[PDB]
Design a binder for this molecule. Structure first.
Ligand code: HEM
Ligand code: HEM
Ligand SMILES: Cc1ccc(-c2cc(C(F)(F)F)nn2-c2ccc(S(N)(=O)=O)cc2)cc1
Ligand SMILES: Cc1ccc(-c2cc(C(F)(F)F)nn2-c2ccc(S(N)(=O)=O)cc2)cc1
Ligand SMILES: CCCCCCCCOC1O[C@H](CO)[C@@H](O)[C@H](O)[C@H]1O
Ligand SMILES: CCCCCCCCO[C@@H]1O[C@H](CO)[C@@H](O)[C@H](O)[C@H]1O
Ligand SMILES: CCCCCCCCO[C@@H]1O[C@H](CO)[C@@H](O)[C@H](O)[C@H]1O
Ligand SMILES: CCCCCCCCO[C@@H]1O[C@H](CO)[C@@H](O)[C@H](O)[C@H]1O
Lengths: 553, 553
């Protein structure tokens, strides 16, 4: 009595429920389809799919015809296409979340419990013949061998788009505020209950820790003065839990919101940048409101930083990644006339695919000197030895590593790539083609169609056996890319939805929160509308270095 | 240097922010008004208010013209008017939430922190001349004296609507799942973090307690067999925290989700009803899915009960209370084409006004025998001595007490009425007329306009002094009512919004959760669509008594 739902019968986001001893049914409610499987099109959906261009065809448009986009950008079409990218990508990702590691069905414990990582698709029944449902071999390839043959870096393959390490560290820094898989509770759980841009990696992840980081005067945060410059406080001044190595001295270890940030001068660099940005905002709010107290000056400055984050993440961060000629625009008012939920729940496949370790180089250049992985990791003095302005100049002048296609993952951080595929099997993620179906994409018929070449494709036909049994994480990294893209179709087509929901799904974007008084007048509401990666750095420094998400070139 | 925001300048939901030493400004963003105070109408809003009938005029329509509503009910207009009541009413309620006891401004702590009771309006700055802003006497009336002169019951004044005690106990039972003001954290905090219909008073309020209440087989809940009937388990069987009297003599103390439920046979009666309803649903789900396990059978049956609750709360509970000829209809699909947030946050004024102790009679009739407050409170054996069917028959045959107008609060429960007005001053709620402005109502110019008579009205002119300084809670109960109504115009026009937002704001109503598979096929999705107060009782009993929200008459 083989579980009928192991064949993934339900198509187009159909929920498969089990009936009787060996029966089943598919709920085709509002999926645009009917019938036993939700395959037979409705009158309107049939017309919509017939006039639907391939995802790659629309990517070609958004990456070609400069002249056309010089016009579109300077017209109201920048909003007709922006709102279209927003609503359409983010549709109904389910909102309110739908599953988690413990449940493969809509439940109140899944919507109420935040300590869970939601999941767009259910897991593969523990009662299914093969590990990935019905297709593939009885055993899946060795995680270590997959990383030493298809993910291991031989020669450095830079990003064709020019992306630099300044972007690489902004990604790891801004992404770790909603990715805190908890050791204790194990995989499928998170410590960052913000599940979005709550700047928990600056103040969070909890309140008890927040106060320890706050100076409690002028709504500022405690700090430390080294070489007449501003950095985070020493753990002595502000005693909070940090995952520093050793050992070490307490006087030389800075404290922030997100831990494991002291294990990289890059993450502590942005911890210093946003720190000076918070206190600077408190100086602007104190002058405007002498009557305001400590609590209001802080919690207000926090909303101002959260606004500057999304502003730089859309109009800058995704603009370098995207490579499009369409100027991405952060304007919450685009979905003010749309049926949109201002809620967000971090998925386990968003945490899964966001492991962009290929971005890390072979080493780390800093002007004349060159530090290796051994000299750069767990560095305590490097941050204060070079300063902020001199360091931001180095990262912006060094290219990062291409994420898609492979094989481009340094041998140092490859142990994470294996702990990601290992965590994939623990969560029991579905195959690669099943997720392709979920994000409006046609499944690959062969391994050669995935990589675009015969050599690895054949080396995979031996391991997995079937294409419908290919793993999720390995599928994204081994997929070929468009001519000068940073990663495969699937990384774009699956990642775009998740991030767009989480940005505009933020409370501040809603009609209730997107006022001028919410940021303490027009002064604070302008800082958000003019937020730039260049002003986030230079305004807090003395000298103005080279700051960008792409190398000079 | 008087705080300018103490005059409540901002009109029509305008946010007042303080500037300089003695200045201020009003944020008129999307309030439909502009100018210094948001008083000048916009082109469209001016036309909307000109064609806006008084709330009492629309009340009159919804309570008259029987012939017209016999037609409307049997037409698609039941949906045109239902959706209209939904969207319009619930749009007065901010979402996401706005403020809480600790903050008088939009902040991330206020949206992230759930242990808070949100609040529709900010508090009265402690740096204001008079306790209620600028109007009124330097001191507010004695809480005890107000309850002994305007709330104390002399002669029993029944509800003109026929409402009975069956409704009175369904109100206190269904309302205490989102009202758990924490005694530890003090006023302005809640233990029920569900902030809605999470049936936390059955399973909740937490997970550790939930397992203790569950049998862990067939997704059922532990129980106890007394006289061949089904009741909740003894604490011995299921050890959970309960607030039974001191040195109370268990065995015989039943355990449920919501505590302080053993202090009333009425609350333990509904704890038994919903208990048999959960296990019965598990029998229907087990037959349909023999393969299903314990976890899925329970968490699914939980969504089925949550659905039956809102179904009975709209088409039955608010039917009685409203006494409108318009058949209220629970259909989540009404706001599927509306800009609605499926989120909810319990306000402190919703907790405030929902104190309907006037509903409690002088005594409690049970067929032949009559028990007083001393014989009925903290009763442990009464529940199992009469059974379920014999008791539901008694409550449905006894009228309750009218809530509005006063003075109709038994001398036994009057100590709560004083602890509600006392909690009002702790939270620093705004005056009565200020909240009237918030919920689309014109402020009262005199105390005589509130009560509708000269005798109390004068006694109040002496105490409060000004009408703009009248307290919130006392304002609702002392307000006259339309002759056959259960409470004043303000109780309707402020409670209707809160209630409606929390019912359809529930996740299950959303487009993602409102499927048939979410309830385990059509079987479970039908139990929700045909949920009745009569089927909730009779189906779980042997004999069928008189069950309703109104006396026989
Ligand atoms: C020197 C560079 C880096 C090092 C040493 C590093 C180290 C690690 C380690 C040890 C883990 C543990 C995963 C596991 O135990 O399964 C991890 C996971 C992760 N990596 Fe990195 N990483 C680096 C760069 C990056 C970058 C550039 C990104 C960009 C997005 C990134 C994204 C993530 C995320 C989101 C997780 C999981 C977060 C969580 O579960 O809390 N990492 N990394
Ligand atoms: C015999 C009947 C009742 C008894 C003995 C009772 C008892 C109490 C007591 C002692 C409090 C403490 C409140 C304070 O200290 O300020 C309370 C709170 C409250 N009561 Fe009742 N009550 C009864 C009926 C009702 C009814 C019929 C309703 C609504 C229909 C109601 C609604 C509330 C609400 C909303 C609170 C707020 C407490 C919280 O937020 O946890 N009560 N009750
Ligand atoms: C994780 C993730 C995935 C996709 C996106 C995204 C969003 C958008 C936009 F425009 F919709 F905002 N584009 N866009 C995107 C599009 C193409 C590329 S590429 N270089 O791989 O071809 C890179 C990014 C962002 C984040
Ligand atoms: C706390 C509270 C307050 C109002 C309502 C409500 C909702 C509705 C409806 F129809 F919109 F659903 N009516 N309605 C209502 C209307 C009038 C009265 S009455 N007894 O003063 O005439 C009683 C109830 C419900 C709960
Ligand atoms: C199904 C009845 C539609 C109206 C008659 C038009 C001809 C049938 O329309 C069709 O229906 C199929 C359904 O899968 C479509 O896929 C095809 O276009 C066609 O066979
Ligand atoms: C001209 C481009 C404006 C429209 C933006 C289309 C968004 C990308 O395109 C579409 O995205 C949808 C969301 O992933 C998916 O249904 C499709 O697979 C994809 O093509
Ligand atoms: C026609 C709609 C706008 C004008 C309002 C007319 C009603 C005046 O207002 C209302 O009239 C009701 C009449 O039944 C009275 O019962 C209400 O108390 C009265 O306030
Ligand atoms: C048929 C009678 C009117 C029902 C449709 C209109 C919706 C009624 O809801 C209306 O809400 C407004 C704002 O919440 C209030 O000011 C009105 O008094 C209230 O009746």
């Amino acid at each position: 009595p083989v579980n009928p739902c192991c064949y993934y019968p339900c198509q187009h986001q159909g929920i498969c429920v089990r009936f009787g001893l060996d029966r089943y049914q598919c709920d085709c409610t509002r999926t645009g389809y009917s019938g036993p499987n939700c395959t037979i099109p409705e009158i309107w959906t049939w017309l919509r799919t017939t006039l639907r261009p391939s995802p790659s065809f629309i990517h070609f448009l958004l990456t070609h015809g400069r002249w056309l986009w010089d016009f579109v950008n300077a017209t109201f079409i920048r909003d007709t296409l922006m709102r279209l990218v927003l609503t359409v990508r983010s549709n109904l990702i389910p909102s309110p979340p739908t599953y988690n590691i413990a449940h493969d069905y809509i439940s109140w414990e899944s919507f109420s419990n935040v300590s869970y990582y939601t999941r767009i698709l259910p897991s593969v029944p523990r009662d299914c013949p093969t590990p990935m449902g019905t297709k593939g071999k009885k055993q899946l390839p060795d995680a270590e061998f997959l990383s030493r043959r298809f993910l291991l870096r031989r020669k450095f393959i830079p990003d064709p788009q020019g992306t630099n390490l300044m972007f690489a560290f902004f990604a790891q820094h801004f992404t770790h505020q909603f990715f805190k898989t908890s050791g204790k509770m194990g995989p499928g759980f998170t410590k960052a209950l913000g599940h979005g841009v709550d700047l928990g990696h600056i103040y969070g992840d909890n309140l008890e820790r927040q106060y320890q980081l706050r100076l409690f005067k002028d709504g500022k945060l405690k700090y430390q003065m080294l070489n007449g410059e501003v950095y985070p406080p020493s753990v002595e001044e502000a005693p909070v839990l940090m995952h520093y190595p050793r050992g070490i001295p307490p006087q030389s270890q800075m404290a922030v919101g997100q831990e494991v940030f002291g294990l990289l001068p890059g993450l502590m660099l942005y911890a210093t940048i946003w720190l000076r940005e918070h206190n600077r905002v408190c100086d602007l709010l104190k002058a405007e409101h002498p009557t305001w107290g400590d609590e209001q000056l802080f919690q207000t400055a926090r909303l101002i930083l959260i606004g500057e984050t999304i502003k730089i993440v859309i109009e800058e961060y995704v603009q370098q990644l995207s490579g499009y000629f369409l100027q991405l625009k952060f304007d919450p008012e685009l979905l003010f006339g749309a049926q949109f939920q201002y809620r967000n729940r971090i998925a386990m496949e968003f945490n899964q695919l966001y492991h962009w370790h290929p971005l890390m180089p072979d080493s780390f250049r800093v002007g004349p000197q060159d530090y290796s992985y051994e000299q750069f990791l767990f560095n305590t003095s490097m941050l204060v030895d070079y300063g902020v302005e001199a360091l931001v100049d180095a990262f912006s002048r060094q290219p990062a590593g291409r994420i898609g296609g492979g094989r481009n993952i340094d041998h140092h951080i490859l142990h994470v790539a294996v702990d990601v595929i290992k965590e994939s099997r623990v969560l029991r993620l579905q195959p690669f083609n099943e997720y392709r179906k979920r994000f409006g994409m046609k499944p690959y018929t062969s391994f050669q169609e995935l990589t675009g070449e015969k050599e690895m494709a054949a080396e995979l036909e031996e391991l997995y056996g079937d294409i419908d049994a290919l793993e999720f994480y390995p599928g994204l990294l081994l997929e070929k890319c468009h001519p000068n893209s940073i990663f495969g179709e699937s990384m774009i087509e699956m990642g775009a939805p998740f991030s767009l929901k989480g940005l505009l799904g933020n409370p501040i974007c809603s009609p209730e929160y997107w006022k001028a008084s919410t940021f303490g007048g027009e002064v604070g509401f302008n800082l958000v509308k003019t937020a730039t990666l260049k002003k986030l750095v230079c305004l807090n420094t003395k000298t103005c270095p080279y700051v960008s998400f792409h190398v000079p070139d």
